[PDB]
Design an enzyme around this catalytic site. Structure first.
Site, short mmCIF file in Angstrom:
data_model
loop_
_atom_site.label_atom_id
_atom_site.label_comp_id
_atom_site.label_asym_id
_atom_site.label_seq_id
_atom_site.Cartn_x
_atom_site.Cartn_y
_atom_site.Cartn_z
N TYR A 58 0.81 -1.21 0.00
CA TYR A 58 0.00 0.00 0.00
C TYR A 58 0.85 1.28 0.00
O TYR A 58 1.65 1.49 0.91
CB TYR A 58 -0.91 -0.04 1.23
CG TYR A 58 -2.16 0.81 1.16
CD1 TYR A 58 -2.71 1.18 -0.07
CD2 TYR A 58 -2.83 1.18 2.32
CE1 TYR A 58 -3.90 1.90 -0.13
CE2 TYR A 58 -4.02 1.89 2.27
CZ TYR A 58 -4.56 2.25 1.05
OH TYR A 58 -5.74 2.96 1.00
N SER A 71 1.25 -7.92 1.99
CA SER A 71 0.23 -6.95 2.40
C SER A 71 -0.74 -6.64 1.25
O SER A 71 -1.43 -7.54 0.78
CB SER A 71 0.90 -5.67 2.90
OG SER A 71 0.00 -4.90 3.68
N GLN A 72 -0.79 -5.38 0.80
CA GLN A 72 -1.68 -5.04 -0.31
C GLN A 72 -1.37 -5.95 -1.50
O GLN A 72 -2.28 -6.42 -2.18
CB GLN A 72 -1.50 -3.58 -0.77
CG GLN A 72 -2.38 -3.22 -1.98
CD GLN A 72 -2.10 -1.84 -2.55
OE1 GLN A 72 -1.01 -1.57 -3.06
NE2 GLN A 72 -3.08 -0.95 -2.47
N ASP A 97 0.99 -9.41 14.06
CA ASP A 97 0.58 -8.41 13.07
C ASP A 97 -0.73 -7.72 13.42
O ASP A 97 -1.80 -8.33 13.36
CB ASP A 97 0.43 -9.08 11.69
CG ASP A 97 0.29 -8.06 10.57
OD1 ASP A 97 -0.25 -6.96 10.81
OD2 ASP A 97 0.72 -8.37 9.43
N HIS A 145 3.70 -7.26 10.86
CA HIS A 145 3.51 -6.92 9.46
C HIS A 145 4.90 -6.69 8.86
O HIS A 145 5.33 -5.55 8.68
CB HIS A 145 2.69 -5.64 9.35
CG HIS A 145 1.98 -5.49 8.04
ND1 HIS A 145 0.94 -6.30 7.66
CD2 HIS A 145 2.16 -4.61 7.03
CE1 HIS A 145 0.50 -5.93 6.47
NE2 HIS A 145 1.23 -4.90 6.07
#
Ligand SMILES: [Ca+2]
Ligand SMILES: [Ca+2]
Ligand SMILES: [Ca+2]
Ligand SMILES: [Ca+2]
Lengths: 317, 317, 317, 317, 317, 317
Positions: free
Chosen positions: A88, A179-180, A269, A298
Site C-alpha cells: 500500500y 500486504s496489499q 501483526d 507486518h
C-alpha cells in the site's frame, strides 16, 4: 489482540458479501475484457546483458494507462512467469531484486497500482472523499466505480497479457506480493483462474468488518475509521457500508482461485489482523498451505522468501 | 525548532515563486469566471426560527459540484457576510456553532473543500499519486491541473456568489478559518480583492520549501516528503518541484490581498512552522495585524476567537 | 478495553454509594442555601450591540467567590437560559462562541470551576494532598470538606441564581458541558431538580472504582492511582476510599434528576470509559436518550452539537 | 538541548530577581521565627534496637502542621545531623534506607513537603489555580502567600529545630536531597546560614525563565506553561510573572549559603536543564564543587551517593 | 540533528586514531594469515537447478568456526564474486534474494558475524561486559582481544578464501552491505586491498566520538552510553575509551581501501549520523562516489539497489 | 494484561521442567563444590570508621573471577549476614546505601553478576548468540554451558563462602534483591538450603513460557523473542527451547528453598508479569508471604523496604 491460533484455523470471516457479488464481478470482467490494451514496451534505462528490461504500459478499464516493470530472460523457448504486486502506497520497486527469479529463467513482471507510488494512472472521476485511502475511494459513488474494483481488474488483465507473451507458457504463471500485494495476488488469481501459483504474504484488503471489530481500523486501515467519523458518525449505515466493501473483500473472491496457494501470517501483526488473514485462507478451495510466524508482525518473515521461491519453482516440470 | 520571534518578524519566505505566477492566476480566474454556477439552494434538515439554513451548491471549474452551508438571518436590509473555510481533511462542521455570527446579523457561509470531509466533489482526472494529499495532487500533471488551484478558485467563486446574494452588502464580506482554512482565507481574499476582512489562524499551505528545510515536512506536510521519497529520492528535480508548488503557496498570493487582515500564530506549532506563517503575514500589503501565542501549537488560541469577532464586527459602522 | 455495547446498556455501575449519601447531600444543600450570594455583575470588556455581557460573581460555600460569564440578549420578556460547565483544568472560555444560543434568545451563563483555569476561588483549607487533582482534594479530610462537594453545590447555587434572573423563566433552564462539564451538568440537574434540560457529553466524575478496575485510572483519572500509590499502596483501605468517593460520584446523584437528559458517548474514549458513562445514564429515571459514537474518543462528536441545540430549543413553546 | 559544558561553567542565570528580594526574605524569616513550633514526637511503628524512630510534627507559618521522620542513634553525646528533602510530589519515603547515615552516628531527619505525598499540611487559602503545581500556587495572590515561600521557611525552621536537639551539634548539620529536594537543600542552607554541609543533586526550582526559554517548561515544569496558556496567553505580563517567581528561585538564594556545597548534574537531564543547575551553582559564594555526569538524566548518578556520604562525614572531626 | 550537507562534504571525523593503529592491524593480519581455515562445504537444504548452494565454514582467529552462505553458478570458467555482510544482530538472511547477482553470473557469499543472528561462533574469553553490544565487547580487555577486531579479520580472511575459489577471478571481487554490513564492507576492502569494488550503505561502526557528541549514542550505538554509565560515569577515561575504539573505527581503516567505492547516506538517519558516514567517505583515497537521500533515514533507499548492481556489474570486462 | 488476583494465587506455572532437572543441578553443585575459590580481599577506596569495606574476589565454575562488595561491621562476635543480588545489566551499586543493614549489625555482601554491569568475569566459550541477553546465552550449547547456570552457582558458592566468614553465623544468612536480583535470591536459597531468610522483589527469570504466552516476551524478556525470530521463526522446536530454559527457571528451583521467604509483586508490572511471580511463589514449600501492590509496576514499592528489613531483623533472637 486476536483469537488464539486454535480458533483462527476455523474462522471464516465477518465482513458481509453482497448478494450480487458474482454478477458484480462477471460484469466487471466483461468491461475489462472489452478494453483494447494498446500495449507499449519501452526499453528501461536499467540494462543487464542476460535479460531485457522493459517498462510495459497497457490501458485498463476507464482508460487508465497502467505501468509494470517487465524483465525477460535472454533464453530460448517458453517458460514460467511471475507477477509481483506491491504494498500500500509503494510501487514496483527496483529492477535488480526482481532478478532472483530471472536467474531461475522466469519472466518477471511487477505492476504499479493506480495512483500510488508508481507510474500507473488513476483517472479518478468519483464522488466523495479523494484525500486519503483507496479502499474508500468511490465508496459513496456507484459500486462499479470503486477504485480497487478497477485495480483488481488491472491485475486480471495484466495476467492475461502476461499469458499472451511469446516467451511465456500460459499454464506456468504465478503471482506474489506482501500486504496489499498479497491481497492483490489473491484477487488476481481469483479473477484470472488460469493463474497456477499464488504467494500471499500477510494479505491486506480482507474481512474489513473484522478489522473494525478488533478496534484495529487504524494504521493501514485507518481510512475505514475516517470514513465513519466523517460520513456516518453514529453508524446508521454500517451494514450497507461494510456490505459494499464486501465487493472488494478478497476473502469473498478467494473461492474462485484455482491455482495452488502458499500464505504466511505473523501472529503479532496488528496491521493485518491474523484473523482477517485466516478468513481469506479458509475461503480458498484449491491446494493451499499457510506458514505461521508467532513472533512476527507486518513484516517479511525469515525463511519464507525461500519457501516462496521453492514453491514458485514448482511451475517448471 | 524555528527562528526567534525577532527574526520571524523579518522573514519573507523561502519557497520560490514561478516567473509566470500572475499570468497563471489571471488565466485561472478567467476559467473560473467563465463557469455557469447553476446555483441550487436546498433547505437543511437543521432549522431554527430566527434564521434560514440552506445547503448551497454551485459548479466550480472542471465541472465539480461544490457545497457550502448557508445561513441567512431573518432580518431586513443588506448586511455583512462571513465565509468560513475548514481544516485539512475536515468539513464545514455543525450548523449550530455558526450561529454566533448570525446573532451578530451576519449571513454565514461555510464551504466544504473538494474531496475532503464534506460534500464537495473532486472530479479528479489527474496523473500521478492520488492516494494521499491534495497539496501534491496534480503535481505531476500540468500546473493548470493542480487540485489546490481549483480549490482556491472555488473560494474566490464562492466569495463572488456571496457578494451577489440579495441580503449581502458586497463591500462587507469577511473570510476566516484555521490551518488549511487560514490558508484558504488568504487565497480567497487574494483572488477576490473585494473581500473586506480576513482572519487567518495559523495558516497552512505556506512557504512549502521552508517547512522541508526545517525537517518538518511531516504531519500535515508529510505528503511533500512522500513525494520526494517516491518520485525524486535524490532531489534531482528539487527546484522544479518547489517552484511548481509555488503556484499554490499562499505567501505568493498574499501581496494581492486588499481587505484588512488579522492573524494568529503559535510559537510551539510544528505543524505550521511560525516562519511559514510569518512569511505569509509579511507579504501582505493591506492593513494587518498578528497575535502571537508563545505557548500554543497547532490549536485554537484562548481569546483569539473573541478578537476575531470584534475584528469582523468592524464591518458595521 | 471495555464491555461490548450490548452489556453497556445494562451496566449500572461499580463504585459504592455511602449509606448516608442522601443525608450527606441534604446537609450539603442546607449549607449552600444559607449562603448570602452577595451577587455582583461587572460589565465585560467584550461587548456586542445585541446583548449585554457581564462577569458575574457570587459567594459559594466556605466563602469562596465564584465567577461565571453571563450573556443576556437584548430582547423583551422572559425566556430560556443555558448554563455551561467546562472541562477539567479549563475555564468558561471565550465569549463569542456562547453567542450561538444567544442567537436563539437564550440567556447564557458559563461557570468557572474553583481553582481551575478560570477566575473562581478555591478557599482550600483541607488536609492531605494539594499538588495534583481536585477529585482527591480533601479525600483525607472530613467528607463534608471534599472540594467537588463544594463545586457541585456551586452549580446548584448558580442554577438557582440564574432562575431568579428577571429575564429568565425558571422552568426553562438547561445545563450543558463536556467531560468534567458533563459530570457537573448531571450534578447540577440533580441538586437543583428545577433544571428542565440536560446535555451531558462523555461525563467525567462517574463510577470511579470502574475506572480503576479497567486499569484506566490514568490520564484525567491519574490522581486516583497516585492517591493509592502514596497513601495506601497495598489497598488496605480500598473500600473506604472508593465509598467516600461515592459522595461525589455523579452516577449516585443521577437518580435525583428530573429534567430531560441527552447524552453522548464515544466507544473509543479511554479517558471516560464507556461503561462509566452508561453507568450514569442507566441510573437516570427521567426522560433520557444517549447518542453512541463508535469511532470517537474523548472529543466533540460530529453532529451532536446540533442535536444538543435542537434538544435545548425544546425549552421554547 | 542546552549550551555546551564550556558555557555552562560561566552561566549565571536568566530568571530575574525582585528588587526587594532581600527584604522579602527577611520579612519571611521574621514571620517563621515568631511561630511557636509546638513540637511533638510520636514513636513510629517502625523500630530497631540501635536507634529511636519518631514521627516529628511542628507548626510552620500560617498554622500548617509539618511532619518529618526523625531517627536518633542510641549513642552518647552530641553528633552531626542530616536533614533530607524529597522529590516533587513524593514524601520522606521509607525508614530503613535512612539508616545508612545512622550507621555513621548521625541523627537523620526527613521532612515531608506541604500538601505533597507525605503527611505535611498545606493550609491553602490562596486565590488562583489550585489544580496542578505548587510552583504557581499563590502566584496570582500576594507574593507573601506563595506556597513555596512557606515550604522554604519550613526547611529553615526545621533546621533550627534540629539544631536545638539535645544530641545534635548545631554546627555539624548537613542537608541533602534530589531534584525538588536539591532545591530545598539550597534554600534551607540559604535561609539558615548555620547549615554546615549541603548536597544538592540536580536541583529543581531554579532559573525558571531559562527553563521556558529552552522550551523545556514541561514535565516537572509543565505548570509554568499551563499558567501562561490559561492566564496570560499572549505573555502581556511575562516579565511580571517571572520576576515574581524570582522570589522562590533558589539561584537567587544561593548567595546566602555559607556551608560547603557538593552538587551533581546530568548533561542529559531535560527535567532540570543543566544550565539551570549551573546557574544555582555559579551563584554560590561558599566552598563548593559539582560532579558532572555526561550520560545521566534526571536520575541518581552512580557513585555520587558515596561521594555525598564521604562529604557529609567531613562533619566529624 | 547534524551539520548541513555543505559542511558534511568537508567533515573528516572526530574519533581519535591510536598512534600504533598501523602496527595494531599489521599484527592482526599476521595472526589471521597464520590460521589454518580448514574449510568445509556442506550442501544446503535449499537447492536450485542453475547453481550450487553450500554452507561454507572456515576457522578464523582464536579458533572460531565462521559460517557463510555460498552460491556458485553452474557456468564454465572464472567470473566475479560478491561478498555480502549483514546488519547488526541480523544474519546472512535467505538464499533466494542472493540469486539476483547469481543471475549475473556472480558467485555470491554472505558471511554471518560471530555471535549474532547467524551460525558463526564467538569463542568469547574476554573480560568486562558480555550482556549487550559487540562494539564494547573486549573493550576493558587487551586491545588485541576486541571482538570487532576478530570480526574485521574474518571478513579479510573470507575475502582471501573467496579469491582462491576455482570459479572466482581474484581480481573481480566486490563486497557490499548496509549499516553494520556497510562498515564491514569498508573494513574488509581495507584489510584485503585486493577487493575491487565496495558498496557501503549508511555504514555503522564509524566515528564513535562524533555519535556521542551529537547525543546520538543511542539505538544501535546505545552500548557506548551504557559503557560510560556503568564503567566511567564522570568520563575520567573518555579520551582513552574513544582512542581504543579508534582501533575499530572504519573511518580510520578507510585510507587503505584500493577498490572503487559507492556509498549512500540518508540525511534523516539518526542511527548512523550523516556526519559519521561522510567521515568514512572522506577518508577514502580510491575512486569513490556517494549518493545522498535527503528524506531517508536508516533504511534502504529507493533506486540505490539498482545503482549498486550496475556498479558491481562493472567487475566484468 | 494478566489473570485476576483470584487466579494468580492458584497459578503454579506454565514453563516445562526438564525430566532430569534434579540431576542436572546436583551435577552442577558437584562442579561448583570442586572449585578452589582462592578468595582474595582488597581494601576498598571507600572507607568508613565503623565498618570494614572490602572488594571480595573468588573463582567460580569455569574459572571465572567473581566480585562482590563486602562490608563487615567493627563489632565483636558472630552475627547475621545479608547477600544482595542486583538487577539485569546493573551491578552491586554504591557502598553507602548498603550501610543501613550494617547499622543493624549485619555483614553485607553484594555480588556482581558475570559479564554485566560490575567486575565479575564471564569466561564465555559458548556457541550461539552472544550479542544480547544472558537468558539465552549458551541456549544453543550443551545445557551444562548455559550462563545463568553458572551465575546461579556463583550465588550458591558465595553463600557458602559467606557462611564460612569468621564473623558470620552460618545459620543466620539472608539473601535479597529486585527483579533479576529477586530471581537470584530464590536460586541462591534453593541451591544453598542453609540460607535462612529470603526477600525476592518482583523476581525475574521465572516461568519463561508464560511470559511468551502473554505477548510480554519483550523489555527485559525481549531476548526470548529475538531467539525464536532468528533461530526458530516457525517455532518448530518450541517445546525443546522452553524445556531447556526450564533448567534456569527459578520457579522450578523454588521447591528446594528452606529459608523463610518474603516477596512483593506489582500488579501493573508488565516486565515481570504477576503470574510468573506467583508461579515462583506458589512453588515454595517453606514459610513464606507475599505483599501485593495493585498500582505498582516493575519498581520499588513504598513501604516494602521497611517490611524487608524488619523481616531480616528476625534473624536476631
Ligand atoms: Ca513442478
Ligand atoms: Ca417546546
Ligand atoms: Ca572533618
Ligand atoms: Ca567493467
Amino acid at each position: 489482540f486476536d483469537m488464539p491460533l486454535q480458533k483462527l484455523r476455523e474462522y471464516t470471516g465477518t465482513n458481509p458479501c453482497p448478494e450480487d457479488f458474482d454478477e458484480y464481478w462477471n460484469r466487471a470482467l466483461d468491461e475489462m475484457r472489452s478494453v483494447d490494451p494498446k500495449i507499449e514496451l519501452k526499453e528501461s534505462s536499467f540494462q543487464v546483458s542476460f535479460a531485457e528490461c522493459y517498462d510495459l504500459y497497457f490501458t485498463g478499464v476507464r482508460g487508465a494507462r497502467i505501468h509494470a516493470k517487465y524483465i525477460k530472460p535472454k533464453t530460448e523457448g517458453k517458460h514460467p512467469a511471475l507477477i509481483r504486486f506491491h504494498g500500500y502506497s509503494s510501487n514496483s520497486g527496483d529492477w535488480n531484486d526482481k532478478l532472483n527469479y530471472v536467474a531461475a529463467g522466469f519472466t518477471v513482471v511487477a505492476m504499479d497500482v493506480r495512483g500510488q507510488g508508481g507510474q500507473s494512472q488513476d483517472v479518478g472521476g468519483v464522488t466523495g472523499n479523494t484525500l486519503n485511502g483507496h479502499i474508500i475511494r468511490g465508496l459513496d459513488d456507484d459500486a462499479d466505480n470503486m477504485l480497487f474494483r478497477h485495480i483488481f481488474l488491472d491485475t486480471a488483465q495484466l495476467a492475461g497479457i502476461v499469458m499472451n507473451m511469446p516467451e511465456v507458457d500460459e499454464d506456468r504463471v504465478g503471482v506474489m506480493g506482501p500486504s496489499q500485494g498479497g491481497g492483490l495476488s489473491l484477487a488476481c488469481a481469483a479473477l484470472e483462474p488460469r493463474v497456477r501459483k499464488v504467494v500471499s504474504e500477510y494479505p491486506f484488503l480482507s474481512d474489513y468488518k473484522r478489522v473494525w471489530d478488533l478496534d484495529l481500523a487504524k494504521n493501514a486501515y485507518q481510512e475505514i475509521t475516517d470514513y465513519f467519523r466523517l460520513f456516518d458518525p453514529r453508524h446508521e449505515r454500517e451494514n450497507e457500508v461494510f456490505t459494499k466493501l464486501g465487493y472488494i473483500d478478497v476473502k469473498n473472491l478467494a473461492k474462485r482461485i484455482k491455482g495452488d496457494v502458499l500464505m504466511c501470517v505473523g501472529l503479532m501483526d496488528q496491521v493485518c489482523p491474523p484473523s482477517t488473514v485466516f478468513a481469506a485462507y479458509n475461503n480458498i478451495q484449491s491446494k493451499k498451505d499457510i506458514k505461521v510466524y508467532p513472533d512476527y508482525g507486518h513484516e517479511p518473515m525469515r525463511g519464507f522468501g525461500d519457501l516462496a521461491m521453492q514453491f514458485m519453482l514448482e511451475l517448471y516440470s
